[PDB]
DNA sequence: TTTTTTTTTTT
């Protein structure tokens, strides 16, 4: 699951499908920190793994060895297949107040943290920004009087969670909004994501450099041994062919 | 002889070497690379020490083969660390570790000489210090570019505390920077971190093989150099995985002598573990070591047979097909004529591992009374060792082995850490004393 | 994020 780490996730059906109804949380601190955006390069190779953050999240392309090696070789076109395997992944995080969850009725009426993907962020951006001409003025889902809850619906297509069907709803007042204690009761359920944004990011670039080195060898721009990594692929297959040559 | 008359790095170390004895008590490790000639400098410190008459030194080599050639060239006898420290195993079900019987005082040993100090592991490291007395002074030789030990339980930087600043101050060795040697200057670049490049003098040097058919071309070049020569003592091919080596010995065996055999009579093989002649004794039998790990041996007779194994508490005996090869001592060690049972089938090997697990399932919680038949555990477990043919060994298992010509196979290395890949290199390059080819 | 998706090597 995910709840033990403190983050809610969906109880997937046999098809992997799932429906749930939740309301969001505004900004934990005043005039700042409504939400969060996480960047993480994630890949698996040689059985070795890498799942850690990126400092280019705050624009520091330099304090990340996974960022630098791209710019030296421009893998985006130099080796785009290798580029996609390792490229930075953008994670969006927010607090959530659950309303209805038939997959797990215990999850209802409670608040969590959560990470999602970018299409929703465009739709979140598409929902929040509306013109004045379409009568419907823009709406904040976290607004106490104007905000809206939203229902997530996902099906699997070729092993991918698809969300193209998602639709939003009207505004909604939140019941018991005039009680400080009911607010406080839920307010402690709110957590501050800005703490995750402070100086928690690894300052030691050389430490990150060491771990991938243990994860994988080769790939040195000034060393140019990465060509030998290109070359190594041929030899294993060449080894297979020479085995029957016996 | 020449006595005090060498280079600054050679002169500086010995004076500091004396200082550790002379100034307070201190322990030092030296990062001598190859070619820097700290072995030649060590020869003098051998000579200089005899005039003082100190016997507190002990000649220690971590491996038997390094101790053998150390004793052979120097002429002075050296002992194994397992004898020096009486490390005795402890039979448990989950894990098992050789363990020193007691902390000795090491009174007669007032100075300590060690080799290949990178190899000794950190968990063992803490135990040894208490065993070591203050008056004894520790002298260590090793390369930071030498290969580190493998710890399945912990994957970390794990630099040998010999190489960690807090334990004690030490000094590195300078090197004859320039010389008319292509490989070492390439090896200098190898220690620097440049990728391998071919450099040749008089037709001999570092040589590369490139292109689509490079391997087959390198293979015919491999075939060209080797031919049907039965003397590979100076021809050592090295690869990391034993998977690759297994397919090699399969193919390679058929090449030199015209037989399709997994193993044929008359083959030369090397131990992968020491050979103990175990006797049943209270506590732990220290047994008698017959063949050391790394000992070369000549096969006397070769045959593939089967043997039924029966465990008390397990009904009946269980047949396992293996190789029953008889082998004799090859080398300068004590001569012994022996015969071993050895399994060389993946089908049988997984069959072998399964028996252990049922025996593991039953022995960990046995209670029909009594204790447990573990005398039939090791007697059945120790009947078979694991050894591999001479031509190829792992870069781990090729360390120390100085041969004339080395052929190098790189591709499987990417699963290893970067620093290890360079430490394999240094060690790998140092295996070829005369020449090296690289594909 | 659907999930730490490969090695052997020491007494
Ligand atoms: Zn990055």
Pick among B407, B410, B438 to test the A interface (most A CBs inside 10 A):
B410
**Cβ of residue A1 closer than 8 Å to a chain B Cβ:** no
DSSP 8-class letter at B196: P
CB contact under 8 A, B421 and A217: yes
Whether residue A133 is found in the same domain as residue A200: yes
The dihedral through the CA atoms of B95, B101, B103, B106 has a sign that is negative
Whether residue B143 contacts residue B31, with contact meaning beta carbons closer than 8 Å, is answered with yes
The dihedral through the CA atoms of B388, B390, B396, B400 has a sign that is positive
Q: How many CA atoms lie within 13 A of A167 on its CB side?
A: 3
Q: What is the dihedral of CA A151, A155, A157, A159, to 10 degrees?
A: 100
Distance in angstroms: CA B150, C1' C10? 7
Three-point CA angle A189, A195, A201, nearest 5°: 140
Distance in angstroms: CA B119, C1' C10? 8
Rg of chain A over all Cα atoms, to the nearest angstrom? 23
Whether residue A231 is found in the same domain as residue A115: no
Of the candidates A189, A179, A181, the residue with the CA atom closest to the CA atom of residue A22: A189
Looking at the C1' of nucleotide C11, which residue has the nearest alpha carbon?
B98
Whether residue A60 is found in the same domain as residue A48: yes
CB contact under 8 A, B419 and A213: yes
Give how far Cα B269 sits from Cα of B67, B255, B392, B437, Å. 20, 17, 10, 24
Residues 6+ apart with CB under 8 A from A42: A50, A51, A89
| Cβ neighbours of A223 in B, within 8 Å | 193-195
| Cβ neighbours of B244 in A, within 8 Å | 239
Neighbours of B391 (CB within 10 A): 20
Q: Which nucleotide is nearest to A2 (CA to C1')?
A: C3
Looking at the C1' of nucleotide C9, which residue has the nearest alpha carbon?
B150
CB contact under 8 A, A223 and B411: no
A 35-54: CB under 8 A from B:
46-48
Residue A177 CA to chain centroid, in angstroms? 31
Of the candidates A5, A9, A31, the residue with the CA atom closest to the CA atom of residue A22: A9
**Cβ of residue A229 closer than 8 Å to a chain B Cβ:** yes
B18: left (phi over 0), alpha (psi -120 to 50) or beta: alpha
| Cβ neighbours of A220 in B, within 8 Å | 193, 195
Query: B412 — phi, psi (to 5°)?
Result: -80, 5
Strand partners of residue B389: B269
Whether residue A68 contacts residue A62, with contact meaning beta carbons closer than 8 Å, is answered with yes
CB contact under 8 A, B254 and A246: yes
The dihedral through the CA atoms of A99, A101, A105, A111 has a sign that is negative
Concatenating the DSSP letter of every residue in B371-426 gives: ----HHHHHHHTTB--EEESSEE-TTTTTT--EEEEEE--GGGGGS-HHHHHHHHH
Whether residue A152 is found in the same domain as residue A222: no
Residue B229 CA to chain centroid, in angstroms? 25
* Block residue for tokens 């930087």: B157
Three-point CA angle A165, A166, A169, nearest 5°: 135
Q: Which domains does chain B have, with CATH numbers?
A: 2-17+19-178 (3.40.50.300), 179-258+390-439 (3.40.50.300), 259-389 (2.30.30.780)
Whether residue A79 is found in the same domain as residue A161: yes
The domain in which residue A225 lies consists of: 218-246
Q: Which nucleotide is nearest to B81 (CA to C1')?
A: C11
Residues 6+ apart with CB under 8 A from A55: A61, A62, A63, A64, A67, A201, A202
Was A143 annotated as part of a binding site? Answer: no
Of the candidates B280, B281, B293, the residue with the CA atom closest to the CA atom of residue B80: B293
Whether residue B394 contacts residue B245, with contact meaning beta carbons closer than 8 Å, is answered with yes
* Alpha carbon distance A33, B314 (integer Å): 67
CB contact under 8 A, A236 and B411: yes
Residues 6+ apart with CB under 8 A from B222: B407, B437
Tokens of A117: 């993907």
DSSP 8-class letter at B316: S
* Backbone break loci in chain A, preceding residues, C–N > 2.5 A: none
Looking at the C1' of nucleotide C4, which residue has the nearest alpha carbon?
A49
* Alpha carbon distance B13, B99 (integer Å): 34
Residues 6+ apart with CB under 8 A from B153: none
Whether residue A242 is found in the same domain as residue A207: no
Strand partners of residue B340: B325
Number of structural domains chain A divides into:
2
Was A41 annotated as part of a binding site? Answer: yes
A28 CA distance to ligand 1 middle (Å): 28
* Alpha carbon distance B397, B388 (integer Å): 10
Of the candidates B142, B101, B98, B140, the residue with the CA atom closest to the CA atom of residue B118: B142
The dihedral through the CA atoms of B239, B240, B241, B242 has a sign that is positive
Whether residue A121 is found in the same domain as residue A170: yes
CB contact under 8 A, B417 and A213: yes
Query: B275 — phi, psi (to 5°)?
Result: -105, 120
Whether residue A15 is found in the same domain as residue A48: yes
Whether residue A236 is found in the same domain as residue A183: no
Was A64 annotated as part of a binding site? Answer: yes
CB contact under 8 A, A218 and B417: no
Shortest CA distance from B192: residue in chain A: A223
Tokens of B273: 């573990």
Whether residue A139 is found in the same domain as residue A237: no
Q: How many CB pairs under 8 A join A and B?
A: 59
| Cβ neighbours of B190 in A, within 8 Å | none
| Cβ neighbours of A209 in B, within 8 Å | none
**Cβ of residue A246 closer than 8 Å to a chain B Cβ:** yes
Nucleotides of C strand lying within 7 Å of any protein CB atom:
1-11
Whether residue A151 is found in the same domain as residue A229: no
Whether residue A102 is found in the same domain as residue A223: no
Of the candidates B413, B427, B420, B425, the residue with the CA atom closest to the CA atom of residue B156: B420
Angle between helices A205-215 and B418-431 (to 10 degrees): 60
Of the candidates B199, B76, B142, the residue with the CA atom closest to the CA atom of residue B400: B142
- The domain that holds A35 is classified in CATH as 3.90.198.10
Distance in angstroms: CA B350, C1' C3? 30
């Amino acid at each position: 699951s995910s709840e033990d780490k403190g983050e809610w996730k969906l109880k997937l059906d046999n098809a992997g499908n799932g429906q749930a109804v939740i309301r969001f949380l505004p900004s934990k601190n005043d005039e700042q920190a409504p939400f969060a955006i996480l960047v993480n390069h994630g890949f698996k190779k040689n059985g070795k793994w890498y799942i850690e953050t990126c400092s280019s999240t705050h624009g520091d392309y330099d304090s990340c060895p996974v960022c630098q090696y791209i710019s030296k070789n421009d893998l985006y076109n130099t080796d785009n297949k290798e580029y996609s395997l390792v490229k930075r992944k953008t994670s969006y995080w927010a607090n959530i107040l659950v309303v209805k969850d038939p997959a797990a009725p215990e999850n209802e009426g409670k608040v969590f943290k959560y990470r999602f993907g970018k299409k929703i962020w465009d739709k979140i951006n598409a929902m929040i920004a509306v013109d004045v001409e379409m009568g419907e003025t823009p709406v904040d889902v976290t607004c106490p009087w104007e905000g809206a809850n939203f229902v997530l619906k996902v099906k699997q297509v070729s092993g991918f969670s698809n969300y193209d069907e998602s639709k939003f709803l009207n505004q909604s007042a939140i019941p018991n909004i005039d009680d400080e204690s009911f607010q406080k009761e839920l307010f402690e359920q709110m957590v501050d994501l800005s703490e995750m944004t402070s100086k928690d990011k690894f300052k030691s670039f050389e430490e990150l450099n060491t771990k991938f080195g243990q994860v994988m060898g080769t790939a040195v721009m000034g060393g140019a041994a990465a060509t030998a990594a290109k070359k190594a692929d041929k030899v294993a297959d060449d080894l297979d062919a020479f085995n029957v040559d016996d | 002889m020449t006595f005090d008359d060498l280079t600054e790095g050679q002169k500086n170390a010995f004076n500091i070497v004396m200082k550790a004895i002379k100034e307070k008590k201190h322990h030092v490790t030296i990062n001598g690379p190859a070619g820097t000639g700290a072995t030649t400098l060590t020869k003098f410190i051998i000579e200089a020490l005899i005039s003082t008459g100190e016997t507190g030194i002990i000649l220690a080599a971590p491996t038997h083969a390094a101790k053998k050639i150390l004793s052979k060239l120097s002429g002075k006898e050296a002992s194994t660390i397992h004898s020096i420290l009486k490390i005795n195993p402890v039979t448990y079900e989950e894990n098992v570790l050789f363990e020193q019987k007691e902390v000795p005082d090491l009174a007669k040993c007032r100075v300590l000489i060690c080799d290949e100090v990178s190899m000794y592991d950190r968990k063992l490291f803490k135990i040894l210090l208490s065993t070591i007395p203050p008056w004894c002074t520790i002298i260590g030789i090793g390369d930071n570019k030498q290969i580190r030990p493998v710890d399945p339980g912990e994957n970390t930087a794990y630099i040998s505390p010999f190489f960690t600043h807090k334990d004690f101050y030490q000094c590195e060795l300078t090197e004859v920077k320039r010389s008319n040697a292509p490989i070492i200057d390439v090896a200098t670049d190898v220690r620097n971190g440049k990728w391998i490049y071919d450099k040749v003098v008089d037709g001999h040097g570092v040589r590369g093989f490139t292109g689509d058919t490079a391997l087959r071309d390198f293979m015919v070049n491999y075939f060209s150099i080797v031919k049907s020569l039965d003397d590979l003592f100076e021809n050592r091919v090295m690869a990391f995985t034993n998977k690759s080596v297994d397919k090699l010995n399969s193919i390679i065996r058929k090449k030199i002598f015209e037989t399709d055999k997994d193993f044929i009579v008359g083959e030369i093989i090397v131990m992968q573990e020491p050979l103990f002649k175990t006797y049943k004794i209270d506590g732990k039998p220290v047994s008698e070591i017959i063949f050391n790990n790394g000992q070369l041996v000549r096969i006397i007779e070769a045959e593939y047979t089967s043997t039924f194994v029966k465990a008390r508490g397990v009904p009946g005996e269980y047949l396992i097909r293996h190789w029953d090869l008889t082998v004799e001592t090859y080398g300068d060690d004590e001569y012994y004529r022996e015969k071993i049972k050895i399994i060389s089938s993946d089908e049988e090997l997984y069959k072998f591992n399964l028996f252990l697990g049922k025996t593991a399932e039953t022995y960990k919680n046995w209670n029909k009374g009594g204790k447990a038949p573990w005398s039939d555990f090791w007697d059945a477990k120790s009947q078979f060792s694991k050894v591999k043919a001479l031509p190829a060994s792992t870069f781990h298992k090729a360390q120390g082995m100085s041969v004339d010509r080395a052929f190098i196979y790189t591709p499987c290395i990417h699963y290893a850490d970067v620093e290890l890949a360079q430490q394999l290199l240094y060690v790998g390059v140092t295996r070829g004393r005369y020449d090296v080819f690289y594909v």
